[PDB]
Amino acid sequence: SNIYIQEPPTNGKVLLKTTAGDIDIELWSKEAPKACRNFIQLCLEAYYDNTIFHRVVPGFIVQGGDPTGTGSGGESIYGAPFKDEFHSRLRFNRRGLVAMANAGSHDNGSQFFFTLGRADELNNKHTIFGKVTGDTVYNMLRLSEVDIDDDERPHNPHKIKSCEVLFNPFDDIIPRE
Amino acid sequence: YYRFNTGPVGKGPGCGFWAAGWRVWLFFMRGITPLLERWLGNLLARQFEGRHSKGV
Amino acid sequence: SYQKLLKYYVLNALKHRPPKAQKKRYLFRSFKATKFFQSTKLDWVEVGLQVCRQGY
Amino acid sequence: QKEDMPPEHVRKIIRDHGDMTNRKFRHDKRVYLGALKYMPHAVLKLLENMPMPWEQ
Amino acid sequence: RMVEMQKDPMEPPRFKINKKIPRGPPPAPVMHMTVKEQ
Amino acid sequence: PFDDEEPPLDYADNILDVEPLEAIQLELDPEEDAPVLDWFYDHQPLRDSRKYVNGS
Numbered sequence: 001s002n003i004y005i006q007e008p009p010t011n012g013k014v015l016l017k018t019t020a021g022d023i024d025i026e027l028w029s030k031e032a033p034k035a036c037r038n039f040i041q042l043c044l045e046a047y048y049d050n051t052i053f054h055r056v057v058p059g060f061i062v063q064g065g066d067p068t069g070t071g072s073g074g075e076s077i078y079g080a081p082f083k084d085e086f087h088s089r090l091r092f093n094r095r096g097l098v099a100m101a102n103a104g105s106h107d108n109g110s111q112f113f114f115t116l117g118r119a120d121e122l123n124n125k126h127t128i129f130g131k132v133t134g135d136t137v138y139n140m141l142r143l144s145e146v147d148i149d150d151d152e153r154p155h156n157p158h159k160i161k162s163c164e165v166l167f168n169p170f171d172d173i174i175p176r177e
Numbered sequence: 178y179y180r181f182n183t184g185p186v187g188k189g190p191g192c193g194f195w196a197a198g199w200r201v202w203l204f205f206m207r208g209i210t211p212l213l214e215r216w217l218g219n220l221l222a223r224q225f226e227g228r229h230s231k232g233v
Numbered sequence: 234s235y236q237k238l239l240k241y242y243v244l245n246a247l248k249h250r251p252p253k254a255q256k257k258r259y260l261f262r263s264f265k266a267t268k269f270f271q272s273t274k275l276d277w278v279e280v281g282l283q284v285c286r287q288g289y
Numbered sequence: 290q291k292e293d294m295p296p297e298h299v300r301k302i303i304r305d306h307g308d309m310t311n312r313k314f315r316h317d318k319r320v321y322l323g324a325l326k327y328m329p330h331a332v333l334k335l336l337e338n339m340p341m342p343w344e345q
Numbered sequence: 346r347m348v349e350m351q352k353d354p355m356e357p358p359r360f361k362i363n364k365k366i367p368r369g370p371p372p373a374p375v376m377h378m379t380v381k382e383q
Numbered sequence: 384p385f386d387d388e389e390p391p392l393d394y395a396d397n398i399l400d401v402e403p404l405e406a407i408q409l410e411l412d413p414e415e416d417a418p419v420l421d422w423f424y425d426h427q428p429l430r431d432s433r434k435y436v437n438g439s
């Protein structure tokens with residue numbers, strides 16, 4: 001009577017209220033303290049409010065986190081793109097993963113994406129700072145249901161209306177004004 | 178297990194007291210080590226030197 | 234089981250030849266004196282992990 | 290005396306070589322394989338030093 | 346100054362010996378029949 | 384305790400950072416068990432004492 005699923009335990013929790021419904025994100029702040037610190041503070045700063053999801057690749061990812069909505073924008077709390085963080089225990093085997101988009105190494109911005117399925121080619125490339133909880137999973141997937149226009153852009157892109165941090169693992173985060 | 182589960186304590190799963198079992202495998206390993214050294218030695222030697230041609 | 238443990242006990246006692254011949258050869262001292270080995274100190278757990286990886 | 294080294298040294302070596310599948314490594318593949326002969330020895334020394342249940 | 350090279354103790358037998366080549370070749374002098382017998 | 388397809392853990396990445404979580408221990412009486420009590424559950428109890436043991 002044993003069916004094993006191996007993954008390190010998470011820490012922290014953040015609620016995303018979107019046009020597609022609620023999304024609960026469990027974060028790994030032991031493995032990815034830098035990108036989870038960035039994400040938590042940017043959520044506390046109202047930086048993700050009314051930010052659309054500008055890129056949807058069917059069965060691959062749905063991408064958001066740009067205040068400008070163009071997809072080339074966004075910035076971190078560190079005044080510069082911060083470092084990538086990888087682990088053998090964090091992989092993409094499945095949909096339900098919340099990871100950092102980049103144009104290359106150490107390029108990490110404020111943009112992030114949800115995994116619509118397996119991507120084995122993004123391994124050791126994008127950092128995985130979180131996962132969506134099963135109960136809220138379907139809502140994430142509704143982010144990916146749109147009529148997609150040119151250059152992977154939805155015609156009516158879903159938005160992030162607000163942000164709630166349910167559990168903050170970091171003591172020292174001070175949101176910027 | 179008999180001695181341990183003597184009184185109130187039941188047939189349940191939780192008895193730790195390995196020391197004994199642990200000993201036993203170590204004695205095993207003490208002897209088997211030289212065997213495996215000799216056998217794995219030969220395995221490696223066949224792999225690298227070649228199976229001896231003569232069967233002399 | 235008690236009967237079988239006595240059987241092991243007695244057999245060991247009966248069987249107990251002295252070493253009968255002795256050599257003081259040392260393995261780790263030979264390995265350690267040679268430049269290909271270095272020594273350190275690690276967490277047991279950490280070594281264990283390292284050994285399993287090495288065996289794989 | 291063979292003074293002992295920083296523990297991170299061995300940590301990093303293995304982490305570099307974690308699978309000796311890297312094109313760069315090459316010659317370790319022969320060397321690593323050779324060791325197999327003393328692996329059981331290593332196991333016995335590992336196991337006999339388990340930590341006991343009162344040690345963290 | 347001749348120095349012997351240190352051998353790696355976990356190195357396997359380097360090269361392969363099995364190959365087989367026919368036995369090599371002066372005789373000492375020996376110094377040692379009737380029809381019916383034939 | 385882990386899947387086959389799950390690779391072995393870097394000690395340094397997970398284990399090193401994390402706390403050790405309490406061992407078994409026992410609540411020795413401060414009064415009656417005092418002699419033994421200060422070093423009872425240390426690794427090699429009285430290693431550094433020129434009074435109690437030979438030495439290292």
Ligand SMILES: O=P(O)(O)O[C@H]1[C@H](OP(=O)(O)O)[C@@H](OP(=O)(O)O)[C@H](OP(=O)(O)O)[C@@H](OP(=O)(O)O)[C@H]1OP(=O)(O)O
Nearest residue numbers: 001178179180181182183186187188189190191192193234
């Ligand atoms: O009572 P448990 O803690 O569950 O122990 C059981 C059980 O012991 P008892 O029946 O004596 O209580 C089995 O006994 P049997 O069912 O075979 O009579 C024993 O089996 P063995 O006689 O082969 O030891 C079995 O082990 P297993 O399930 O492998 O047979 C062992 O539990 P474990 O499996 O936990 O040892």
